[PDB]
């Protein structure tokens with residue numbers, strides 16, 4: 001595989017969004033991956049409605065602001081026959097009744113693909129598919145205060161993930177400890193967090209924070 005990948009440079013990634021005080025990260029991860037695959041298909045980048053997923057994908061197993069899974073979101077888009085644009089169904093950071101309108105659907109998928117639980121497989125998927133939905137252990141103060149550099153948290157769990165995010169690439173940079181590889185991750189906490197909303201997460205360090213443990217993307 002390549003040693004560096006950044007799908008932002010190829011037009012696959014919308015700007016950083018902000019889930020607010022709603023446990024809807026899974027929806028932002030899901031729209032991010034679907035935005036990328038829709039762009040792969042049509043050559044048009046359209047921001048998608050996380051609120052549509054928060055309000056409507058309960059029957060697939062999601063629980064609004066109380067948590068969800070990206071794969072359940074991909075199943076909803078398939079089952080439902082569409083997903084509205086961000087513009088048509090904007091984000092309110094609270095769960096409401098479903099207001100999906102098929103007239104404003106701009107995205108579809110025919111299922112999803114779960115990636116083997118290995119960083120080697122995740123790298124191959126990032127290199128060849130596009131942005132990949134992943135789950136990580138983000139429950140540490142170090143993650144809140146992240147400014148720059150490669151994020152490494154010794155107390156991070158590789159099995160107990162609690163936050164869905166989007167891998168948009170990977171790369172390297174020289175460091176004091178010579179742990180130089182990172183995943184480029186788009187978060188959903190706004191631009192003021194991290195590096196313009198992004199974090200470089202330790203790569204090839206025993207599946208740090210579980211980033212390869214629940215990786216998937218929609219089939220478009």
Ligand SMILES: *[C@@H](O)[C@H](CC(C)C)NC(=O)[C@H](CC(C)C)NC(=O)[C@H](CC(C)C)NC(=O)OCc1ccccc1
Nearest residue numbers: 023024025026063066067068069135161162163164214
């Ligand atoms: C982030 O905004 C949000 C916070 C709320 C839980 C308050 N996190 C999630 O929704 C979280 C993301 C996943 C990808 C880790 N989902 C869950 O915690 C999930 C919610 C249920 C209601 C679907 N709970 C769970 O046990 O998910 C199973 C799982 C977790 C990790 C990998 C595979 C499967």
